[PDB]
């Protein structure tokens, strides 16, 4: 799966919580992103 459609330059997705968030209009991460009422973070197997 290494040669993805985006070319070998890109390997891991560049998205984050800020993108596609209705409650935050900015394009960069900010505390308002955590202020969103539809976001939650979990720890799985203590290593993820």
């Amino acid at each position: 799966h290494y040669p993805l459609s985006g070319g070998p330059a890109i390997l891991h997705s560049l998205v984050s919580e800020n993108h596609d968030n209705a409650h935050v209009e900015g394009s960069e991460l900010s505390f308002e992103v955590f202020r969103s009422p539809n976001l939650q973070l979990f720890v799985f197997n203590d290593s993820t």
């Binding site: 290494y2 040669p3 459609s5 985006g6 070319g7 070998p8 330059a9």
Partner: protein
């Protein structure tokens, strides 16, 4: 979309200065002075060969002439091959994997 690499820039061969001068270890005014017996201490290459190395000298000369002809032929074929090839050399052009 697909990843299409940017085209390579076109190179120009005539880059940098070129010089063709004459090198003399001593100024020409020195050459006017007549030679003395001390200036002949360093023997000439003509007198440096002895009678025991004449056949060897001739064999080396013939071999060197043959090698010069062979190297001239190789230079001709190499320059012909180089002019046959194009700038984007397929055998060594790195491209992204499909």
């Amino acid at each position: 979309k697909l990843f299409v690499p940017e085209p390579r820039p076109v190179p120009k061969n005539d880059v940098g200065f070129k010089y063709s001068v004459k090198h003399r270890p001593f100024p020409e005014e020195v050459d006017k002075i007549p030679f003395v017996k001390a200036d002949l201490s360093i023997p000439d290459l003509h007198e440096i060969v002895t009678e025991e190395l004449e056949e060897r000298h001739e064999k080396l000369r013939s071999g060197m002439a043959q090698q010069i002809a062979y190297e001239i032929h190789l230079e001709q074929q190499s320059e012909e091959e180089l002019q046959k090839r194009s700038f984007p050399d397929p055998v060594t052009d790195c491209k992204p994997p499909p």
